[PDB]
Design a protein around this ligand. Structure first.
Ligand code: CLA
Ligand code: CLA
Ligand code: CLA
Ligand code: CLA
Ligand code: CLA
Ligand code: CLA
Ligand code: CLA
Ligand code: CLA
Ligand SMILES: CCCCCCCCCCCCCCCCCC(=O)OC[C@H](CO[C@@H]1O[C@H](CO)[C@H](O)[C@H](O)[C@H]1O)OC(=O)CCCCCCCCCCCCCCCCC
Ligand SMILES: CC1=C(/C=C/C(C)=C/C=C/C(C)=C/C=C/C=C(C)/C=C/C=C(C)/C=C/C2=C(C)CCCC2(C)C)C(C)(C)CCC1
Ligand code: SF4
Ligand code: SF4
Ligand code: FES
Lengths: 42, 143, 743, 80, 73, 73, 53, 73, 97
């Protein structure tokens, strides 16, 4: 548990989880505001 | 001052089957080496050129074409087995020249009868620039 | 002396202690890292069990459970394939009409416009056309619904779970000991008779009851949903008696020895099914039956516990003669104490086997509707060729590792190994001469043809019309094969393949399944090119193995270990003087050889076999016999093969084959990228990282794990792996895009 | 013949001497350190230029330096 | 034209990076502080200290010719 | 076309040679104490800043030019 | 009984003695060639060799 | 070749070639006068670079002159 | 913490005070019982000893056989004395063999 928490924070696993979260975020963002070549709000 | 041992031909050599890694024309025309050891018993050892040979109980004398090959076999003999060895260099003249260990004690052990050759009394960062030795035949490190 | 199960209880307790600690196996790693090089080492020596320790027992226990883990991975992959065929496929539509619908078992999500990859594969379905040939396997096994595929996927999932659990169990709870592994007599007895004998007998049992009747029903034209379920064929027997009358006697023929009464479904026809374009299933069943009998007898050779059998040591040490001294005496002791010897033998044999499989599968298509599915055929051949080549190179790698680490004439002396080590120089010199001669007289012919053609002198060219180099031996052999059925294989009706000859073209759905393949001068030239490339890669690998311990250059190469950068720029320069470096080259030459082989196959097939048949029997091939006249000069390969065939992939953009165009370009990129690692050295890079580190330190952002450039060996490893990835991937994209567009 | 030099930063560890394939280096008395020993190179005509000695030097910077120079057949390690 | 001109700019900058690094590091660096007494062109400084393949300034020129060819291409 | 390409390749080779001989000068003919604190020595003494910034510029150009090309593709 | 022996029984010269290298007829043949006719005036050996080539 | 394969490999191949030549009848009557050695490290980098650049120049010149000369426009 | 360290030596056997976070050889110099050394960086045989009781941390070790760690030998310069261990000095050659 403590050691599982440690292993889940080793560099490869920390980075894969981080990048999976980032990928999910970007994917959803472009799923809501697709085909965006500019910033049209202000 | 450690009269070197003189090479004794008629000393037998290990039981080998022959190999294509032995001597060549360079041993015929320029030089070759000869190593000797003394073998508490008859055993199997890996040849520094080919496969495996059997050192005889009693004097063993092996002729190799490279000094580096001799030292390799000597190291293997000296630490895997516990055997004291010496090797010489033979010219096409019939001259022999005792090579190692030069003054009877291995070079990893300091001996009080050796002079300093190629020692610089300064740190390596205090060599002159090459511009300082331009157009003179000297090298900045040889100084 | 006797053989038994021998185990140890709870050798290592399952725990999360060592997961928290990176490189626990290596003492130096366990402590922690000072620089970036430590991270690379952690991965490079993860599975080198024989250096984490010296105990053979521990090495073998680790090996056993790692094999279990690998089996679990394979099962998960299989279950994924079956589930995708069950859920995201058009397998039933394809089953209704095989030669119009394109098989595809992968769809994509519409995220960034990538849904264009969901192309029209027919059947009211939009997906990515697959080349795995899985639909053909499922059809040949009798699978008609997707419920059966679902059940298969779930069964393979629970099998993967079982394999993972067994891996944990046999390492942390009940781990065998050394005398259990070192028993190879019983192990061979069980793998020959139990794994291959019972396995193939069981498969023949499947085909006799499931695939034979269901495929009979499918080829009779029945709607796939109107076919009886397979278990009915077991419950009601007259269902089988209708298709196969001699299922009526029911196994009394098997014991009366009136085996001829089984001639219905146990045939020796040979050739192809004119309806499906595959081998006769009644032939494949008979084949597996005979294979089973053979393996079941063969797994009874070695003695285990009851006196009868063969001691492998006795067989080995009985073989020796006047040329080899005491040969084979002492090999049994070598092949049972070193895993690397076994690994290299098995790798060589498995690579040989994979390539034989590729050839035989292209020549005698075993699955229905496989021959006329050109994309599947091309992909299967190419994939198996690559796998075989890689395995064969690994064989050499591990032979060298054995020679460096485990060879010892003091305690384990063998005569043959010693003799070969003693005349390695003669061996390598003659192999060198053969490589040179073969390279001059195969590629030199191509250069002569190119200049003879460029100087407007085609009469002087080595071609079918100017100076013929006819492969008379191959022509003679294949004519002997064509005449075989009836003359010297009286029980066969058709020759074993259709590439032998006899006419008898077979087509399916207006496409050519197979026809006799003609061998002309271009075949001679390219076969000698093949011989040349194989000989050169053999030279590199054999030179690496034979000179792994010592040479006339550096006399103590074994003390430097199996893998190392060099021993300084002395004696003129000793860059890559190690055994590992020889494997690095062999991979380059293996790449060359396999690339030429698959190019030869693809061009020859698209030029003389594949194509479309028509009403008169006029066969228009993909390229009108342009291989016989254009393949004899390098300009022909560059123009008629690469430039011509390459147009399909370039025009892929804007369609559903766009991903292949993208992968074409990306593979070109990564291949070119490898050259940065393959042409440079780590000194320049260390000196550049120095100033980058300065830039970081100036802003208090320098890392504590000091960044080092890669090792010399690692740089070569990065360079060779990227090179192979790039080249193989660009060939993959080209082949697939071309054969899916023109096929 | 390559040229091997020994500099006074030598701590007389002797690891380099134990590393050289051709017996070029030696240990000789001295007084500038706590070992009263320093490395000598009396037989550089046998030096192959392998530079194993430099990889064995634990000083910073090195105390044993090999400058490759004119080549002999001894220097090139040729058995033919 | 915009995209290809920036490809040109990258080519120029990388070639000059290689060459300038080779020039300013010719007299010695941290990986080899005494490079100047080894000459302009030499093999390497053995496999010690991590490995020093292509550490000359000649090797920097050798590496920069590839980038020159590529950029002029 | 031939004239343009010819002269551009020749110019590229000449530039690479200019930098190579700069390095050769720094090794063979450079005298540090006679060049104490002038522009040459001060070039030599902040080489890390020059090299790091050249590397930044080339990284930026490469990243973004390749990225735009791949996005378009 | 063994066929391959070291050269002249010397196991430290870099070669071996085998059938192709040292069997009776092949030795007689090689010795009966102009190149290996040591005791013959070189001009006549060159003549024989040159005419054949 | 000269850029990927390194000296050690070739040196050992050359030494076994030397054995082969010295050991064969009717041809050991001929003796070389310089012992054959593999190319140097720097020499090999130079040879590979020369080959690379010559191939580069020649194939691009061929393509350029043939593609403009073919259309002549 | 600061466990007593015993060292057999041709000069005799003495006892000195030194904290577990420091090498036995380094605090030995602070007291003043002379021991041999050369590199002081854990890569040579000069400061070699072996142990009678207890054991020292092998974390500060390098250039040693994959056995010298558990067969007894150790380097005074690179070693943390985790207990009231008793060690040998002047032990290079019967280590050098
Ligand atoms: C197509 C081949 C190729 C490519 C792409 C590069 C690319 C690069 N080279 Mg290189 N080079 C090459 C061939 C190549 N070279 C060859 C054949 C040689 C002769 C040996 C050299 C010799 C050379 C030298 C001497 C130097 C470079 C340098 C550089 C870098 C320049 C900085 C830059 O442009 O920013 C980046 C440009 C890029 C193209 C990087 C794109 C790659 C992206 C980031 C991939 C993104 C990953 C993505 C998320 C998915 C990854 C996949 C996954 C499996 C991880 C750059 C990464 C210089 C350098 O180091 O710069 C400081 C340097 O000094 N090169
Ligand atoms: C080698 C095996 C393999 C491979 C390469 C794929 C590949 C793919 N699958 Mg599949 N699948 C497999 C096995 C496999 N599957 C197995 C064994 C099953 C169960 C029998 C399934 C069940 C399944 C379903 C139901 C679906 C897919 C889908 C997909 C596609 C979307 C990828 C994805 O997961 O979405 C995105 C990836 C994520 C959201 C992250 C995955 C995290 C989940 C929770 C599992 C991984 C956690 C892990 C255990 C830790 C993709 C091409 C989807 C599809 O085809 O779209 C039409 C889809 O709906 N798969
Ligand atoms: C901005 C660019 C962009 C973006 C954001 C995306 C985004 C996406 N693409 Mg896409 N793509 C792009 C460009 C892009 N693509 C381009 C340019 C191409 C042309 C080459 C493609 C071609 C493409 C294809 C063909 C597909 C996608 C797919 C996908 C989707 C999922 C990919 C996936 O799930 O992987 C794979 C996920 C898995 C395999 C799930 C597995 C989960 C983990 C790995 C399980 C591991 C645990 C396991 C149990 C370990 C085993 C241990 C064992 C011993 C127990 C995703 C939304 C896929 C899709 O649409 O899904 C249907 C898909 O098929 N893309
Ligand atoms: C009829 C008996 C039998 C059978 C069928 C097998 C089958 C297999 N053995 Mg095995 N083996 C046997 C007896 C048998 N062995 C004996 C007597 C010994 C010596 C005592 C060994 C020692 C041995 C070793 C050292 C290894 C194998 C391995 C393998 C696998 C090879 C990889 C493969 O081909 O995948 C084919 C895949 C399949 C056939 C899928 C079906 C898997 C079935 C369920 C296996 C069940 C058979 C098993 C013996 C059941 C007994 C265990 C039981 C108590 C539960 C394979 C599954 C390799 C391995 O372990 O891989 C992990 C390997 O490393 N065997
Ligand atoms: C391991 C393979 C295998 C298995 C599990 C079976 C199983 C079965 N076979 Mg069968 N069979 C097999 C191989 C196999 N066969 C092969 C290779 C042949 C060709 C020689 C036959 C030829 C055969 C005939 C002719 C008959 C069976 C029949 C049967 C069924 C009768 C049940 C019984 O009494 O036993 C049974 C389910 C009988 C049947 O069909 O049951 C309805 C029957 O008449 N088999
Ligand atoms: C049954 C097959 C088999 C097995 C069991 C082994 C087992 C072993 N091999 Mg080996 N080998 C094999 C086949 C096999 N090999 C083949 C076919 C080749 C020819 C290529 C080699 C060549 C080879 C070499 C040269 C070496 C080994 C070594 C080793 C040992 C350590 C491997 C390791 O941990 O490295 C770690 C594993 C990795 C770092 C994985 C690397 C990732 C690869 C390169 C990328 C693959 C790309 C992927 C397919 C697609 C791209 C994905 C990406 C885009 C996301 C180990 C005992 C090493 C050794 O020292 O032996 C003692 C050694 O150096 N092998
Ligand atoms: C020595 C190199 C060599 C190699 C590796 C191959 C390899 C191959 N040849 Mg081939 N061949 C060769 C030389 C070679 N050949 C020569 C010199 C000739 C006569 C010009 C032929 C004529 C030939 C024909 C007509 C055919 C092949 C074919 C084939 C393929 C099938 C196997 C076969 O039939 O070979 C058979 C080889 C022989 C019968 C002769 C082998 C050479 C013998 C053993 C002595 C070696 C000669 C040596 C160089 C000179 C004398 C030695 C000297 C020092 C005294 C195969 C890939 C077949 C093919 O093309 O498949 C499609 C085909 O039909 N070959
Ligand atoms: C050397 C070329 C050659 C080859 C490859 C074959 C191959 C074959 N023959 Mg054949 N045969 C040949 C020459 C050849 N034959 C000649 C010259 C004659 C005389 C004209 C015959 C007469 C002959 C007859 C009468 C029959 C075959 C049959 C067969 C097939 C079964 C093999 C068999 O009986 O198992 C091997 C039998 C053994 C006892 C194992 C011994 C291993 C051998 C002797 C070594 C098989 C594919 C049978 C058939 O029709 O196939 C269905 C069959 O009935 N052959
Ligand atoms: C997944 C959860 C793992 C939970 C875990 O490892 O902690 C729970 C413990 C680690 O926790 C340890 O437990 C020990 C007794 O088992 C002692 O009580 C220790 O004090 C305690 O820290 O590990 C496990 O029991 C999990 C075993 C493997 C499960 C998979
Ligand atoms: C007039 C005019 C104008 C202006 C212009 C200008 C301002 C110019 C320029 C320019 C420039 C500005 C140029 C340049 C270039 C440069 C270069 C190209 C460089 C170089 C260098 C080098 C190569 C170096 C070498 C060396 C080294 C390396 C070190 C040592 C020393 C030496 C020197 C040897 C304009 C257009 C606006 C407008 C119109 C008019
Ligand atoms: S270069 Fe090689 S042979 Fe010469 S002193 Fe150094 S280690 Fe010894
Ligand atoms: S450091 Fe590099 S260039 Fe120098 S000898 Fe070793 S591998 Fe060759
Ligand atoms: S003095 Fe060298 S390891 Fe202690």
């Amino acid at each position: 548990m403590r050691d599982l928490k440690t292993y889940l924070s080793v560099a490869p696993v920390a980075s894969t989880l981080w990048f999976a979260a980032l990928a999910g975020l970007l994917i959803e963002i472009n799923r809501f505001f697709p085909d965006a070549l500019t910033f049209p709000f202000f | 001052g450690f009269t070197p041992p003189e090479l004794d031909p008629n000393t037998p050599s290990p039981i080998f089957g022959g190999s294509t890694g032995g001597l060549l024309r360079k041993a015929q025309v320029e030089e070759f080496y000869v190593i000797t050891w003394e073998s508490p018993k008859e055993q199997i050892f890996e040849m520094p050129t080919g496969g495996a040979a059997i050192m005889r109980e009693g004097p063993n004398l092996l002729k190799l074409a490279r000094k580096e090959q001799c030292l390799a076999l000597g190291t293997r003999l000296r630490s895997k087995y516990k055997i004291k060895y010496q090797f010489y260099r033979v010219f096409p003249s019939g001259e022999v020249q005792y090579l190692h260990p030069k003054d009877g004690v291995y070079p990893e052990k300091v001996n009080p009868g050796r002079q300093g050759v190629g020692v610089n009394f300064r740190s390596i960062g205090k060599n002159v620039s090459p511009i300082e030795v331009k157009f003179t035949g000297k090298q900045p490190y040889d100084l | 002396p006797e053989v038994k199960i021998l185990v140890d209880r709870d050798p290592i307790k399952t725990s999360f202690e060592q997961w928290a600690k990176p490189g626990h196996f290596s003492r130096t790693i366990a402590k922690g890292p000072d620089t970036t090089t430590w991270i690379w080492n952690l991965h490079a020596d993860a599975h080198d069990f024989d250096s984490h320790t010296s105990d053979l027992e521990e090495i073998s226990r680790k090996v056993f459970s790692a094999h279990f883990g690998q089996l679990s991975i394979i099962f998960l992959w299989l279950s994924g394939m079956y589930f995708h065929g069950a859920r995201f496929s058009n397998y039933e539509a394809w089953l209704n009409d095989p030669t119009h619908i394109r098989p595809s078992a992968q769809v994509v999500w519409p995220i960034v416009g990538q849904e264009i990859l969901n192309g029209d594969v027919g059947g009211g379905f939009r997906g990515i056309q697959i080349t795995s040939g899985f639909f053909q396997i499922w059809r040949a096994s009798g699978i008609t619904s997707e419920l059966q595929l679902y059940c298969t996927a779930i069964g393979a999932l629970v099998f993967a779970a079982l394999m993972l659990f067994a891996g944990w169990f046999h390492y942390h709870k009940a781990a065998p000991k050394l005398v259990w592994f070192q028993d190879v007599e019983s192990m061979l007895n069980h793998h020959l008779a139990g794994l291959l004998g019972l396995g193939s007998l069981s498969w023949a049992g499947h085909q006799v009851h499931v695939s034979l009747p269901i495929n009979q029903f499918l080829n009779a034209g029945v709607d796939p949903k109107e076919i009886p379920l397979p278990h009915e064929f077991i419950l009601n027997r007259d269902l089988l008696a209708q298709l196969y009358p001699s299922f009526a006697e029911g196994a009394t023929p098997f014991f009366t020895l009136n085996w001829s009464k089984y001639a219905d479904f146990l045939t020796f026809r040979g050739g192809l099914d004119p309806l499906t374009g595959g081998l006769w299933l009644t032939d494949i069943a008979h084949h597996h039956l005979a294979i089973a009998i053979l393996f079941l007898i063969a797994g009874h050779m070695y003695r285990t516990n009851w006196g009868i059998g063969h001691g492998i040591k006795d067989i080995l040490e009985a073989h020796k003669g006047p040329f080899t001294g005491q040969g084979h005496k002492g090999l049994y002791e070598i092949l049972t104490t070193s895993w690397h010897a076994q690994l290299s033998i098995n790798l060589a044999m498995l690579g040989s086997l994979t390539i034989i499989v590729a050839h035989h599968m292209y020549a005698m298509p075993p699955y229905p509707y496989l021959a006329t599915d050109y994309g599947t055929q091309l992909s299967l051949f190419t994939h198996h060729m690559w796998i075989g080549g890689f395995l064969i190179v690994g064989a050499a790698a591990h032979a060298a590792i054995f020679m460096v680490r485990d060879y010892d004439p003091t305690t384990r002396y063998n005569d043959l190994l010693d003799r070969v080590l003693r005349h390695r120089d003669a061996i390598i010199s003659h192999l060198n001469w053969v490589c040179i001669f073969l390279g001059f007289h195969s590629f030199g012919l191509y250069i002569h043809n190119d200049t003879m053609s460029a100087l407007g002198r085609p009469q002087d060219m080595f071609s079918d019309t100017a100076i013929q180099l006819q492969p008379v031996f191959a022509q003679w052999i294949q004519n002997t094969h064509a005449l075989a059925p009836g003359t010297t294989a009286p029980g066969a009706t058709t020759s074993t393949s259709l590439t032998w000859g006899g006419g008898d073209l077979v087509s399916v759905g207006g496409k050519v399944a197979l026809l006799p393949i003609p061998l002309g001068t271009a075949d001679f030239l390219v076969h000698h090119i093949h011989a040349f490339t194989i000989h050169v890669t053999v030279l590199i690998l054999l030179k690496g193995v034979l000179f792994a311990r010592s040479s006339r250059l550096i006399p103590d190469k074994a003390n430097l270990g199996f893998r190392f950068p060099c021993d300084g720029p002395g004696r003129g320069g000793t860059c890559q003087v190690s055994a590992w470096d020889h494997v690095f080259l062999g991979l380059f030459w293996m790449y060359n050889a396999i690339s030429v082989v698959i190019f030869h196959f693809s061009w020859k097939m698209q030029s003389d076999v594949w194509g479309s048949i028509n009403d008169q029997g006029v066969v228009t091939h993909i390229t009108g016999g342009n291989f016989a006249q254009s393949s004899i000069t390098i300009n022909g390969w560059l123009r008629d093969f690469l430039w011509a065939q390459a147009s399909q992939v370039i025009q892929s953009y804007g369609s559903s084959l766009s991903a292949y165009g993208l992968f074409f370009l990306g593979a070109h990129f990564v291949w070119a990228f490898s050259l940065m690692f393959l042409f440079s050295g780590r000194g320049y890079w260390q000196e550049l990282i120095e100033s980058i580190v300065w830039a970081h330190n100036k802003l208090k952002v320098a890392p504590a794990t000091q960044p080092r450039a890669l090792s010399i060996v690692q740089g070569r490893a990065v360079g060779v792996t990227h090179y192979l990835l790039g080249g193989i991937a660009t060939t993959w994209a080209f082949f697939l895009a071309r054969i899916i567009a023109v096929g | 013949s390559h040229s091997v030099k020994i500099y006074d930063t030598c701590i007389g560890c002797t690891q380099c001497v134990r590393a050289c394939p051709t017996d070029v280096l030696e240990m000789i008395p001295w007084g500038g350190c706590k070992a009263k020993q320093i490395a000598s190179a009396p037989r550089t005509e046998d030096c192959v230029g392998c530079k194993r000695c430099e990889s064995a030097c634990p000083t910073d910077f090195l105390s044993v330096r090999v400058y490759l120079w004119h080549e002999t057949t001894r220097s090139m390690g040729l058995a033919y | 034209d915009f995209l290809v001109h920036h490809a040109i700019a990258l080519g120029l900058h990388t070639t000059t990076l290689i060459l300038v690094k080779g020039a300013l590091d010719a007299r010695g660096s941290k990986l080899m502080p005494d490079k100047k007494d080894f000459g302009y062109s030499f093999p390497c400084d053995g496999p010690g200290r991590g490995g020093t393949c292509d550490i000359s300034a000649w090797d920097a020129f050798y590496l920069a010719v590839f980038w020159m060819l590529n950029t002029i291409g | 076309a031939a004239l343009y390409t010819h002269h551009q390749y020749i110019a590229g080779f000449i530039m690479t040679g200019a930098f190579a001989h700069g390095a050769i000068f720094f090794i063979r003919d450079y005298n540090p104490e006679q060049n104490a604190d002038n522009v040459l020595a001060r070039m030599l003494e902040h080489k890390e800043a020059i090299i790091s910034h050249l590397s930044w510029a080339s990284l930026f150009l490469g990243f973004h030019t390749l990225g735009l090309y791949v996005h378009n593709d | 009984y063994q066929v391959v022996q070291p050269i002249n029984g010397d196991p430290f010269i870099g070669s071996l003695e085998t059938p192709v290298t040292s069997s009776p007829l092949v030795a007689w043949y090689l010795s009966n060639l102009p190149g290996y006719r040591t005791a013959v005036n070189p001009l006549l050996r060159g003549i024989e060799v040159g005419l054949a080539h | 070749m000269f850029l990927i394969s390194w000296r050690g490999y070739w040196q050992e191949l050359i030494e076994t070639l030397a054995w082969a030549h010295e050991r064969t009848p009717l041809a050991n009557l001929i003796r070389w006068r310089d012992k054959p050695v593999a190319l140097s490290i720097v020499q090999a980098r130079l040879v590979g670079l020369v080959h690379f650049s010559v191939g580069y120049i020649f194939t691009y010149a061929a393509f350029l002159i043939a593609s403009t000369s073919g259309k002549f426009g | 913490a600061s466990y007593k360290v015993k060292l057999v030596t041709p000069d005799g056997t003495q006892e000195f005070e030194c904290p577990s976070d420091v090498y036995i050889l380094d605090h030995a110099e602070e007291v003043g019982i002379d021991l041999p050394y050369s590199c002081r960086a854990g890569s040579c045989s000069s400061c070699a000893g072996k142990v009678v009781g207890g054991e020292v941390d092998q974390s500060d070790g390098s250039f040693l056989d994959d056995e010298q760690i558990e067969a007894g030998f150790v380097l005074t310069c690179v070693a943390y004395p985790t207990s009231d261990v008793v060690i040998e000095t002047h032990k290079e050659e019967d280590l050098t063999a």
